[PDB]
Subunit: 218 residues, 4 copies
Amino acid sequence: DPDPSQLHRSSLVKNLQNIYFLYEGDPVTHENVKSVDQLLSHDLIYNVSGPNYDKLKTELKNQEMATLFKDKNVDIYGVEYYHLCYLCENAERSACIYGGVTNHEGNHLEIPKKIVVKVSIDGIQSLSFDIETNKKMVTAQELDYKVRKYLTDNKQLYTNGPSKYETGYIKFIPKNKESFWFDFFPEPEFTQSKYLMIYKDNETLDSNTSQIEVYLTT
Amino acid sequence: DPDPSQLHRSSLVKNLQNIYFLYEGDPVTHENVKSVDQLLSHDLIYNVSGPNYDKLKTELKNQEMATLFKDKNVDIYGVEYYHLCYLCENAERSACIYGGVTNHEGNHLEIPKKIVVKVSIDGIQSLSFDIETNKKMVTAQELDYKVRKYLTDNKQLYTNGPSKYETGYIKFIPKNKESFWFDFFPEPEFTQSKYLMIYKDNETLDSNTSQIEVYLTT
Amino acid sequence: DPDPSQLHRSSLVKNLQNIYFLYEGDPVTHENVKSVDQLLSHDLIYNVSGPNYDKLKTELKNQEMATLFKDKNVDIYGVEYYHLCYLCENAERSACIYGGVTNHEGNHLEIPKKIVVKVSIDGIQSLSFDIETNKKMVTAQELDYKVRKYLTDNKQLYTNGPSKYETGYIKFIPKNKESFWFDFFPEPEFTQSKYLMIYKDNETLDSNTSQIEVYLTT
Amino acid sequence: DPDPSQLHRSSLVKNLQNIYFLYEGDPVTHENVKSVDQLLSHDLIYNVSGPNYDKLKTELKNQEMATLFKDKNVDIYGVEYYHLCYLCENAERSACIYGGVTNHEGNHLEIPKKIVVKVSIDGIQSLSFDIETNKKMVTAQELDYKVRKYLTDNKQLYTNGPSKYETGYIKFIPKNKESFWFDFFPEPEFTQSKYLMIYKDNETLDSNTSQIEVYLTT
């Protein structure tokens, strides 16, 4: 578990709104789509449209993972960025994400699984809410975005300026796997593209057995 | 005027939507704003916010024009682009425009000195609508966007796909000055940052005494 | 002819060494090559190599100029730049130039033609030197490069720092064609890609009837 | 150690010469220098020159490492790249590297320690040679380059085209510490800037108690 020393201080961050706009906006979501191209051996390019893009590139873990989803119909759920997301200098309206991929066939639920998020602020676990997913195997990114979105709208985790909290992080607890975590704040000088690397491994958890804990300090 | 041939054929332009998205959307408009920085000698950077940018860079004719508006209160009105709009890796969420700058102090009309636009579909002077601005001195770019947004929203000038027309252009007839015209369609393979260079010379005209002529074909 | 007030001052330029490296290094030269691709409608891409590049893109005046040289065997001569020369994100070892393209078939001389350059410094043209070429129809860019290459090495026109001259321009006087000139110095804050735009028109002159004059001041 | 399946096949790589150029040319070496700037919190910018560059930005592991070397007098030994080395988006002549940073104070040797490299080919120990450094603690990058530069020149590990070997990796064996290896070949579609990330950790070994082994297959 994170030691207080290695947690990013939100007050040191210059341009914290750049994170706010990543988690305040809508995520890119598409279902039953298939890769159409590749730039590097570890990414995949989809022909999908959303507001602000008509092409989507996702960067996976390595070439092994990419070629695994290459000819499969998948679902994409991710947090995109547009700056530093080039395809060929001639392809405008492009969007980029890390991971956010899972197989379409056989991964949906007719009735969605609600995960109850245990949020703790300043040591006291004074908050809890449910998040939702209709996927059996869901990426940590989809659940992460959903938690931050709620905390943003309701508890002002992020605002178009400073944040309400100094430090904070989310922790996923898989049943048979090792628990991992993400820091809600980036380094003082950062980039959306570098911060979102936390999604590159494309870690997917079983929505039926996983737990989520959030820890924030004022 | 142009020799009906050198004009650009919409049918040949692949990825026409990219043009459409530039005029179908809202323009960038700010009043009584002052330049705050500069990347190259002929551009000016403003700290203005929009639903996609936190900074706006405007490229002007030459360093002389830029040094002219550098420390003045102006009105900005242009069509911004994002792909290939770089200030530095540490300045994402930036928008770029060409010209679109006018003096603010003394240049407003208590009442919009509306200008009449006479269209001409296939030679036969067909349609004719009304444009309007409350600027004594207004840039051709501002009037050109107003003239295009309309023709789009009501005559399908551009669409999320192809165009109702093959060729087409706008002719600007200033009182005492040579008359210019902008081609409505780009080259088959274009870029938004390259096509918007038609606003780079920051050509401003008198709203009170000037006429616009739009032509088209099918 | 330029007015003294219009010439850019070298003392005002920051990072002038960036121009120095442009004209002190070797130019990119290739003979009898054919365009292998194309990015935008007005450029051409060649699969040619040199130290630092395995691909070369040349930007011409417009699409008419581009489509004219497309399927032809041309000769290339230009001053290349790398920063802001993007091909498709994974096209490392790529170079960019403006124009510098001439037809290959029947445009060469058995014996190189010598062209005298009259170099006037502070109003006194007490210097003359030689420039050579084996092209009948040569580009201004090729002659201009050869001039500055000689002036840099012999007269310290450019150095890895300041220039020995405040101003200076090259004037090309073609036989029965109007003369043109290029300013040796850029605006204070500049980029290599924007300054080299002087060659974009691909202006070519007759090496038999063309004269060159260089005006410098200290 | 890597299971043969784990190693990248060189025959599958498109543009394997982009690797060749990285290790055939001279590295960027600078001793006793101090960082003058910073773009992102995990990088350091140095005002040092070499051919093709006037600025050098080194990307380290995280912000702690960067702040750790920030104001110290360091030595730099790295393998640079230029494509995608975005700095100010108006700063040409920049070279980028990863790590390759060691403290200058109290780290040199009177006599350069020589390290023996054992090269096994197709499983048979077939060649041993010498590499040398004047540093007590040296980056794995420095030694890696030294090893590869020798094997390239003498055994055609890489060439401007294909390589003699199908797979190959280098194994660093420190005294008290776990060993680690670097694959000599990249994924089929790679980028110099992504491939060179094997040096981001800035791992440094003791030049007096470390061994190097190289395994190649044809």
